[PDB]
Structure 1
């Protein structure tokens, strides 16, 4: 199948195409949120332990947490719940979704690294990505730097420099 994996410490993420039914039978008969060792599926992932966060079956239907039932169903979905974006206030809709349990019916798994092995990955571990923004709240900054109730957040601001042309500015 395919594995969309994420190393959240770096903040990076990468896809991996996979074969070997008898390596992915480890993932078979599992739920979302459980943990799984990595060398069981690939020696490249030796010492790695992964958590599952989601998946998308063939025909496009996602999964949902602790629903049950490795097959598909239809469910009524509303606000403050995944898999449904309401286009009208109070709206609800009966959508098809796939269960939480893992099986061969998936084209994709969504994996996240909770602990690193010993060999490092070129796409996740070596590289790192930035936090594309910084705080905007005063106390958020004050605890970001752990300063005080007095330490001039206006001095501890972060500014981004853009180069529209020859002229640049720190925003």
Structure 2
């Protein structure tokens, strides 16, 4: 049973959960359900805890802070591509949309670009 922000009581309790809290995916609209979830205080009673770096210091740990994974889907709406490339005004956004290569071995090497919104 996963953890939950705001329970503040170590161990496992049961919560009545609607759409939008956490830890619960509702199956029809308005369906609430009572489920058991774990507190936000950590103990030695976990099977795995999830852990996120906010700052890099000393050196390169192998497999974790190296070999940069490329961001393969860039912007789609016509406002964050204007916020990314710092286009001042009317600089033909259709020219500057990120075009991804597609690399099947049985086909000729395609490239593919999204649509544009707004």
**Take 1:115 and 1:159, find their aligned partners in 2: how far apart are those partners?**
32
**Take 1:66 and 1:120, find their aligned partners in 2: how far apart are those partners?**
34
Q: How big is the shift at 1:128?
A: 1.5
**Take 1:63 and 1:160, find their aligned partners in 2: how far apart are those partners?**
38
Aligned counterpart, 1:159: 99
- Higher relative contact order (CA closer than 8 Å, sequence separation 6+): 1
Aligned counterpart for 2:83 among listed residues 134, 140, 143: 143
Aligned counterpart, 1:47: none
**Take 2:17 and 2:24, find their aligned partners in 1: how far apart are those partners?**
6
**Take 1:116 and 1:147, find their aligned partners in 2: how far apart are those partners?**
32
TM-score, normalised relative to structure 2: 0.88
Greater share of helix: 1
When the two chains are superposed, the root-mean-square deviation of aligned CA atoms in Å is 1.2
Instruction: Answer whether contact 2:72 2:100 (CA < 8 A) is retained.
Output: no
TM-score, normalised relative to structure 1: 0.62
List 4+ stretches of structure 1 deviating above 6 A.
Answer: none
Structure 1, gaps ≥5 residues long: 1-60
State yes or no: 1:66 paired with 2:6: yes
**Take 1:87 and 1:81, find their aligned partners in 2: how far apart are those partners?**
14
State yes or no: 1:130 paired with 2:70: yes
State yes or no: 1:105 paired with 2:45: yes
Instruction: Give CA deviations for 1:85-136 in whole Å, capped at 9, x if unaligned.
Output: 0001000000010100000111111111011120221112122112231110
**Take 1:119 and 1:148, find their aligned partners in 2: how far apart are those partners?**
39
Instruction: Give CA deviations for 1:62-107 in whole Å, capped at 9, x if unaligned.
Output: 0001211111000001111110000010000000101000001111
